[PDB]
Amino acid sequence: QTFRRLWPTIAPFKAGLIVAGVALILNAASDTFMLSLLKPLLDDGFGKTDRSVLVWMPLVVIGLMILRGITSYVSSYCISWVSGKVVMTMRRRLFGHMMGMPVSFFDKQSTGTLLSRITYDSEQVASSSSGALITVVREGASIIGLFIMMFYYSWQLSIILIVLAPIVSIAIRVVSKRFRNISKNMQNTMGQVTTSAEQMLKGHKEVLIFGGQEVETKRFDKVSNRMRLQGMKMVSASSISDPIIQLIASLALAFVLYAASFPSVMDSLTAGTITVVFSSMIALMRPLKSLTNVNAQFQRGMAACQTLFTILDSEQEKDEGKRVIERATGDVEFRNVTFTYPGRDVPALRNINLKIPAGKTVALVGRSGSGKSTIASLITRFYDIDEGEILMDGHDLREYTLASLRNQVALVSQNVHLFNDTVANNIAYARTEQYSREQIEEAARMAYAMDFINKMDNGLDTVIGENGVLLSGGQRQRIAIARALLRDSPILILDEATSALDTESERAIQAALDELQKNRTSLVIAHRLSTIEKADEIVVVEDGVIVERGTHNDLLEHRGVYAQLHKMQF
Amino acid sequence: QTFRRLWPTIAPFKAGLIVAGVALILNAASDTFMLSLLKPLLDDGFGKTDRSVLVWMPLVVIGLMILRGITSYVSSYCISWVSGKVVMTMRRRLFGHMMGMPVSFFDKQSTGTLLSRITYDSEQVASSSSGALITVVREGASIIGLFIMMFYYSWQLSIILIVLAPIVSIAIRVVSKRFRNISKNMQNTMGQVTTSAEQMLKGHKEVLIFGGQEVETKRFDKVSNRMRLQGMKMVSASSISDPIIQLIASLALAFVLYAASFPSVMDSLTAGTITVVFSSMIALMRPLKSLTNVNAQFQRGMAACQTLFTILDSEQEKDEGKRVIERATGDVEFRNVTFTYPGRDVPALRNINLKIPAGKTVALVGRSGSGKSTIASLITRFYDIDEGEILMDGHDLREYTLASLRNQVALVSQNVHLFNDTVANNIAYARTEQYSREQIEEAARMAYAMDFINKMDNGLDTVIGENGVLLSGGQRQRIAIARALLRDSPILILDEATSALDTESERAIQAALDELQKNRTSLVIAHRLSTIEKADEIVVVEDGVIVERGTHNDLLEHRGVYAQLHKMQF
């Protein structure tokens, strides 16, 4: 239905498409005029044989192609102008909306596929609309102006010619639907074979160790020609179109002549007229064949568009007006909370009632498959609860927005998303507001982070492109901790394991970190034999519920499943 | 230059190309002929005005169409076949080559890049090479065959057109140079700006939790404005071209029309003749416009041809020849071997000296950066040696042929893969098969595997394709260990532990698994307390250069890294 709802996005800049349309009717007019005013020499300059008009006409045709060249140029150009900021409005409103998503409505997608959605889907509805529209209005113009033009000379010869269209029409279209069904078949089975090769190519390792070089060759070998097989299918019924696409049309150009013999057995017509009808063959056939594809497509623009709408109308999470609220480092308490990714499909939490204070360090225990990064989606609230009020001061879950949640709670990037610009824009965006370089760049110096900035390109001013990466990675997590410096950091979530990072930078990242997490809450998966007792609070979470809590001397002597998970995972 | 590297692989089947070509040439000739059929209408069929000439030509033109029709079909079908053959051959060559690529060549690679390459790679070089041909000779053919008509009538009216045609040609090559300008750095733009939006979109976890909506504003809006203005860069420059190139024709026409009516003021030709000469002019316009194109277009297809050659640039790796091996366990021995994925980059495995008896579980207690998951990579020869010797019972590193290492090496991976075939034919790969279905069935009986095999669609015979989607990774390993019966898998790596699976079917399998691995050397990823004190060994390695081998608690009193990895791993 999109075309009916289509216009509002398009509306204001229409005048671009207006000079488009006028240049377009003029464009066809340039064609059928050149064919018109080409021949009247042939009307006269041979039989009449006068050289006055003979030198007249060359200049008029070259001027006419002046009109056609210019009208083609600025025409297509103003089409790409209007389509230009059309697709701007679309692309970016799309964009702000698709980060108006809850997290999974991102997560099913990947950066790549979803960017395919933006670039090639808006680039799609673009190329669809514009291409189709210009074929339909433009070729409509050629066929009518030409047509009536045909009337300007022999009227009965005209109509008995315009017997042209119908047969061509339904014939080319039925051919096209032969093409649609075969396009289906080769497309589907094509995907199946494509994935077949995909996965064999995914299996080379095991292929080796089992010694199946032959089968992997030969079992796929027929598949190889198998694809080729359907290859010779698609081209065949493809190329047949033209073959059985001219006959009928040619018959028309055949037909007319005998029929144009009939008033010319009784002496109908001049020559110029009989010549202008050949120009009706080819010149009239062009906008017809075109019509087919033009229309058969003006639907594709329909398809991709309405899909793009499907992704457009999705839900962006809401508020009553909430927050900023009373701001503090706060006590972030799980209160009998339960939350599941969906409720019905994958259930997650059970009744977590867990008390965190303001300023005290806290650790965690758990396992993989317990959603240790989901607990983020508890407090950093990638999603809300299904159940129970995470509360500081009994602060209702829907009287706190993520807004000064995330500004009243913060994180240490498991890996940092960077922006390509003076990376003081990344590190300084975490709630920037005309802040001085002293305590953040000192957060390089004071927190030991200085080693990865002044040592590196652009000195201390750094800016690079390509995902801002060039800084050293783990130390770059210390820059994440540097935003965490800017934060007046109320609460902290992060993941620091015993798995990996480089050495002096390791004990200096976690110890200098120890310098920058001072007096402020901690959250992680508790690992290292250093941090078991140090972080002043611990918990177990089991299938999304917390059995037992307290620092490792509390729970060590407490004999629960805490020590169990502690040893069986870590 | 490769064209005669590659073509001599194309030689043998070309005869279809031959019938193609002759169809082509005579296609052009058909076009020309009907153009000649123009005039007798006017200058004899009319100037005489006889129902004869004007009653004999319709049938000849409709018959002529056919020549071009059927012909055309042969060309489309001929090329399709050559593609399904030319490419297909080069394909099969590629697949042998690429399965010949050890894991490194896929350490630089991916399935979509290489996979999509095989299809696109060969699925391209064939296109532009071919379409290049049919155009260049088809068109040259149109233009040559047509000359006879123009020259056969007016020789000098021709020549004054023939000095011209190369001028149009340099006009379209200079146009070409402006365009290829637009096609040199604009791809650079697309890449860089896309990648910008890419990171933008992937990181809305960062933007979200930090509130970058208003850096999304001016950020994505300026990346926008440059995105659209990039757009009308592309379409601007790209669309000035035809608006000018074409127009130059008139300069060619008007020149012929009047200034070439100066030979008809001085007795040039007749009426009809001049009429046919026009359409020879335009019928010249098309192919000439097509030949410079075939140049760049050709250089386009041969370039892809040599990315395909970039594929062949690699070696499918070789050896001197070594064996016969004896099939048994003995004592599998690491001898001081050295490896890193690239030589100097990732420290992985260096001076690895170890030996294992039959039936002895080898636990992996070791820390990443020493390459625990990396170990088997050598001894299954995913990779080959930097230094040292892989040996059992002093079996020379150079007396064991890589092929029959693949033979006597055994595995059950932490992952799994299948071969398209019935639940029993999937597990019919190992051992090349050829055996009966009796104790492979029973091999599944002891494997705990039967129940999710047989209860599945098609009973015990289960037919589940694309490698049986509904059998889980652990399941497919399970049955695949029945394929370790078909192999009697002598020397084994695996993961069954607290790492990844459901623990009920974990101990269920590994009970049956271990019952099947008995009487043969076996290794494990060490997590469970069951195995760590059940395994007759536990080994530890420092950064690929081993600290520890031997029995469990006698190095639990090592006072070394052993008890360490018991505290910070378990």
Own/partner long-range contacts of B52-55 (Cβ < 8 Å, ≥24 apart): B54/A257, B54/A261, B54/A264, B55/A258, B55/A261
Least CB-CB distance to B567: which of A73, A235, A529?
A529
B11: tokens are: 């030689």
Query: Is there a contact between A521 and A359 (Cβ–Cβ < 8 Å)?
Result: yes
Query: Is there a contact between B198 and A115 (Cβ–Cβ < 8 Å)?
Result: yes
Contact yes or no for B275 and A42 at CB 8 A = yes
φ/ψ (deg, to 5) at B356: -135, 135
Contact yes or no for A202 and B73 at CB 8 A = no
Residues 6+ apart with CB under 8 A from B167: B252
Nearest 5°: CA angle at B269, between B264 and B274?
90
For tokens 């492109």, the residue is: A465
Contact yes or no for B382 and A205 at CB 8 A = yes
Strand ranges for B484-544 from DSSP E? 522-525, 537-542
A175 alpha-carbon distance from chain centroid: 34
Q: Which residues of A are annotated as a binding site for ATP?
A: 366-373
H helix or E strand, kind and range, residue B368: none
Query: Is there a contact between A23 and A79 (Cβ–Cβ < 8 Å)?
Result: no
Which residues on A lie below 8 Å from B237 (Cβ)?
Answer: none
Contact yes or no for A228 and B88 at CB 8 A = yes
User: CA-to-CA distance for A470 and A418, rounded, in angstroms?
Assistant: 11
How far are the Cα atoms of A9, A119, A161, A225, A310 from residue A306, in angstroms, in the given order? 14, 16, 41, 38, 6
Shortest Cα distance from A254 to chain B (angstroms)?
5
Query: Is there a contact between A417 and B203 (Cβ–Cβ < 8 Å)?
Result: yes
User: CA-to-CA distance for B311 and B304, rounded, in angstroms?
Assistant: 11
User: CA-to-CA distance for A362 and A439, rounded, in angstroms?
Assistant: 26
**Largest alpha-carbon pair distance within chain A?**
120
Nearest Cα residue in chain A from B200: A419
Contact yes or no for B228 and A87 at CB 8 A = yes
Query: Is there a contact between A489 and A461 (Cβ–Cβ < 8 Å)?
Result: no
Residues 6+ apart with CB under 8 A from A128: A297, A298, A300, A301, A302, A304, A305
User: CA-to-CA distance for B309 and B534, rounded, in angstroms?
Assistant: 54
User: CA-to-CA distance for B262 and A176, rounded, in angstroms?
Assistant: 49
How far are the Cα atoms of A73, A130, A184, A239, B7 from residue A294, in angstroms, in the given order? 21, 10, 20, 19, 39
Q: Which of A475, A482, A491, A473 is nearest to A442 (CA)?
A: A482
Provide the 10 A C-beta neighbour count for residue A509: 23
Buried b (16+ CB within 10 A) or exposed e, B145-168: bbbebbbebbeebbebbeebeeeb
User: CA-to-CA distance for A256 and B411, rounded, in angstroms?
Assistant: 79
Contact yes or no for B498 and A569 at CB 8 A = yes
Contact yes or no for A76 and B235 at CB 8 A = yes
**B293 at the A interface (CB within 8 A)?**
no
A154: tokens are: 């022999």
Which residues on B lie below 8 Å from A38 (Cβ)?
Answer: 278
User: CA-to-CA distance for B368 and B366, rounded, in angstroms?
Assistant: 7
What is residue B500's three-state secondary structure?
Answer: coil
What is residue A420's three-state secondary structure?
Answer: coil
A108: tokens are: 């099913």
Query: Is there a contact between A460 and A428 (Cβ–Cβ < 8 Å)?
Result: no
- Which one-letter DSSP state was computed for residue B53? G
Least CB-CB distance to A208: which of B210, B278, B406?
B406
Rounded to 10 degrees, the C-alpha dihedral A45/A49/A50/A56 comes to: 20
What is residue B538's three-state secondary structure?
Answer: strand
For residue A361, give the amino acid letter.
Answer: T
**Largest alpha-carbon pair distance within chain B?**
120
Provide the 10 A C-beta neighbour count for residue B112: 12
**A211 at the B interface (CB within 8 A)?**
yes
Contact yes or no for A568 and B46 at CB 8 A = no
H helix or E strand, kind and range, residue B363: strand B361-364
**B530 at the A interface (CB within 8 A)?**
no
Provide the 10 A C-beta neighbour count for residue A121: 20
What is residue B528's three-state secondary structure?
Answer: coil
**Ramachandran region, residue A416 (left: φ > 0; alpha: ψ -120 to 50; beta: rest):** beta
B242: tokens are: 């035809």
For residue B223, give the amino acid letter.
Answer: V
User: CA-to-CA distance for A296 and A136, rounded, in angstroms?
Assistant: 11
φ/ψ (deg, to 5) at B98: -80, -40
How far are the Cα atoms of A14, A215, B106, B191, B528 from residue B507, in angstroms, in the given order? 70, 34, 35, 51, 10
Q: Which of B148, B64, B282 is nearest to A279 (CA)?
A: B282
B418: tokens are: 């299948």
B327: tokens are: 């099939």
Buried b (16+ CB within 10 A) or exposed e, B272-309: bbbbbbbbbbebbbebbbbebbbeebbebbbebbbebb
Provide the 10 A C-beta neighbour count for residue A116: 13
Nearest Cα residue in chain A from B252: A62
Which residues on A lie below 8 Å from B270 (Cβ)?
Answer: 46
Contact yes or no for B261 and A194 at CB 8 A = no
**B91 at the A interface (CB within 8 A)?**
yes
User: CA-to-CA distance for A509 and A518, rounded, in angstroms?
Assistant: 14
Q: Which of B495, B491, B546 is nearest to B349 (CA)?
A: B546
User: CA-to-CA distance for A167 and B452, rounded, in angstroms?
Assistant: 60
For residue A305, give the amino acid letter.
Answer: C
Query: Is there a contact between A376 and A493 (Cβ–Cβ < 8 Å)?
Result: yes
Which residue out of B30, B35, B99, B221 would a mutagenesis test of the A interface target, given it has the greatest number of A Cβ atoms within 10 Å? B99
Contact yes or no for A236 and B567 at CB 8 A = no
Provide the 10 A C-beta neighbour count for residue B108: 9
Contact yes or no for A417 and B265 at CB 8 A = no
Which residues on B lie below 8 Å from A118 (Cβ)?
Answer: 197, 201
* Resolution of the entry in angstroms: 4.2
Q: Which of A118, A15, A29 is nearest to A72 (CA)?
A: A29
Query: Is there a contact between B143 and B288 (Cβ–Cβ < 8 Å)?
Result: yes
How far are the Cα atoms of B375, B446, B554 from residue B561, in angstroms, in the given order? 19, 39, 13
Q: Which of B63, B290, B322 is nearest to B176 (CA)?
A: B290
Find the DSSP H helices in B154-255. 155-162, 165-182, 186-202, 204-210, 213-240, 242-245, 248-254
What is residue A519's three-state secondary structure?
Answer: coil
Contact yes or no for A85 and B258 at CB 8 A = no
Query: Is there a contact between A69 and A10 (Cβ–Cβ < 8 Å)?
Result: no
| Pairing outcome for strands B332-340 and B387-392 | antiparallel
Which residues on A lie below 8 Å from B208 (Cβ)?
Answer: 99, 103, 402, 406
Shortest Cα distance from A486 to chain B (angstroms)?
12
- Which one-letter DSSP state was computed for residue A269? -
User: CA-to-CA distance for B516 and A9, rounded, in angstroms?
Assistant: 67
Find the DSSP H helices in B12-109. 15-37, 40, 57-99
Which residue out of B419, B425, B483 would a mutagenesis test of the A interface target, given it has the greatest number of A Cβ atoms within 10 Å? B419
User: CA-to-CA distance for B447 and B480, rounded, in angstroms?
Assistant: 9
Contact yes or no for B88 and A406 at CB 8 A = no
For tokens 């150079």, the residue is: B398
Q: Which of B390, B368, B335 is nearest to B525 (CA)?
A: B368
Residues 6+ apart with CB under 8 A from A526: A363, A364, A365, A532, A535, A538, A570
Query: Is there a contact between A484 and A492 (Cβ–Cβ < 8 Å)?
Result: yes
- Give the length of chain B: 570
Least CB-CB distance to A243: which of B69, B278, B466?
B69
How far are the Cα atoms of A143, B33, B364 from residue B360, in angstroms, in the given order? 86, 87, 13
User: CA-to-CA distance for A9 and A308, rounded, in angstroms?
Assistant: 13
User: CA-to-CA distance for B296 and A425, rounded, in angstroms?
Assistant: 45
User: CA-to-CA distance for A353 and A334, rounded, in angstroms?
Assistant: 5
Contact yes or no for A225 and B84 at CB 8 A = yes
User: CA-to-CA distance for B70 and A239, rounded, in angstroms?
Assistant: 10
User: CA-to-CA distance for B309 and B304, rounded, in angstroms?
Assistant: 8
Touching A: B residues 362-421, CB under 8 Å: 368-369, 380-382, 403, 406-407, 409, 411, 413, 417, 419-420
User: CA-to-CA distance for B73 and B63, rounded, in angstroms?
Assistant: 16
Contact yes or no for B201 and A567 at CB 8 A = no
Contact yes or no for B246 and A425 at CB 8 A = no
B165-182 vs B213-240: helix crossing angle, rounded to 10? 170
Nearest 5°: CA angle at A307, between B230 and B228?
10
Buried b (16+ CB within 10 A) or exposed e, A446-472: bbbbbbbbeeeeeeeebebeebbeebb
What is residue B101's three-state secondary structure?
Answer: coil
User: CA-to-CA distance for A229 and B476, rounded, in angstroms?
Assistant: 33
Which residues on B lie below 8 Å from A80 (Cβ)?
Answer: 231-232, 235-236, 239
**B344 at the A interface (CB within 8 A)?**
no
Strand ranges for A277-358 from DSSP E? 334-337, 352-354
User: CA-to-CA distance for A549 and B350, rounded, in angstroms?
Assistant: 44
**B83 at the A interface (CB within 8 A)?**
yes
Least CB-CB distance to A46: which of B198, B271, B403?
B271
User: CA-to-CA distance for A299 and A129, rounded, in angstroms?
Assistant: 9
User: CA-to-CA distance for A120 and A90, rounded, in angstroms?
Assistant: 12
Nearest Cα residue in chain A from B96: A217
Touching B: A residues 104-143, CB under 8 Å: 106, 110-112, 114-115, 118-119
Q: Which of B157, B263, B267, B253 is nearest to A38 (CA)?
A: B253
Q: Which residues pair with B337 in a beta bridge?
A: B352
Q: Which of A253, A275, A282 is nearest to A160 (CA)?
A: A253
Contact yes or no for B199 and A275 at CB 8 A = no
Nearest Cα residue in chain B from A99: B204
User: CA-to-CA distance for A300 and A307, rounded, in angstroms?
Assistant: 11
Query: Is there a contact between A294 and A136 (Cβ–Cβ < 8 Å)?
Result: yes
How far are the Cα atoms of A19, B120, B313, B524 from residue B310, in angstroms, in the given order? 50, 14, 5, 40
Contact yes or no for B76 and A235 at CB 8 A = yes
Touching B: A residues 165-194, CB under 8 Å: 192, 194
Residues 6+ apart with CB under 8 A from A250: B61, B62, B65
Q: Which of B79, B113, B84 is nearest to B98 (CA)?
A: B113
Touching A: B residues 455-494, CB under 8 Å: 466-467, 487
Buried b (16+ CB within 10 A) or exposed e, A74-99: bbbbbbbbbbbbbbbebbbebbeebb
Solved using: cryo-EM
Query: Residue B68, class by beta-carbon neighbours within 10 Å (0-12 exposed, 13-18 middle, 19+ buried)?
Result: buried
Residues 6+ apart with CB under 8 A from B468: B418, B423, B426, B462, B476
User: CA-to-CA distance for B493 and B414, rounded, in angstroms?
Assistant: 8
Shortest Cα distance from A461 to chain B (angstroms)?
20
- Give the length of chain A: 570
Q: Which residues of B are annotated as a binding site for ATP?
A: 366-373
Q: Which of B250, B78, B276 is nearest to B171 (CA)?
A: B250
- Which one-letter DSSP state was computed for residue B480? H
Q: Which of A446, A525, A215 is nearest to B419 (CA)?
A: A215
Buried b (16+ CB within 10 A) or exposed e, A319-352: eeebbebeeebbbbbbbebbbbbeeeeeebbbeb
Taking 3-state DSSP, the helix, strand and coil percentages for chain A, each rounded to the nearest 5, stand at: 60, 5, 35
User: CA-to-CA distance for A312 and A95, rounded, in angstroms?
Assistant: 9
What is residue B542's three-state secondary structure?
Answer: strand
H helix or E strand, kind and range, residue A115: helix A111-151
Q: Which of A346, A378, A359, A331 is nearest to A546 (CA)?
A: A378
What is residue B416's three-state secondary structure?
Answer: coil
Q: Which of A195, A160, A115 is nearest to B202 (CA)?
A: A115
Residues 6+ apart with CB under 8 A from A77: B232, B235, B236, B239
Provide the 10 A C-beta neighbour count for residue A564: 14
Which residues on A lie below 8 Å from B236 (Cβ)?
Answer: 77, 80
| Pairing outcome for strands B537-542 and B361-364 | parallel
User: CA-to-CA distance for B550 and A341, rounded, in angstroms?
Assistant: 46
Provide the 10 A C-beta neighbour count for residue B220: 20
Find the DSSP H helices in A350-435. 374-379, 402-406, 424-427
B141-153 vs B155-162: helix crossing angle, rounded to 10? 140
User: CA-to-CA distance for B177 and B189, rounded, in angstroms?
Assistant: 19
What is residue A511's three-state secondary structure?
Answer: helix
Work out how many CB contacts closer than 8 A connect A with B: 303
**A266 at the B interface (CB within 8 A)?**
no
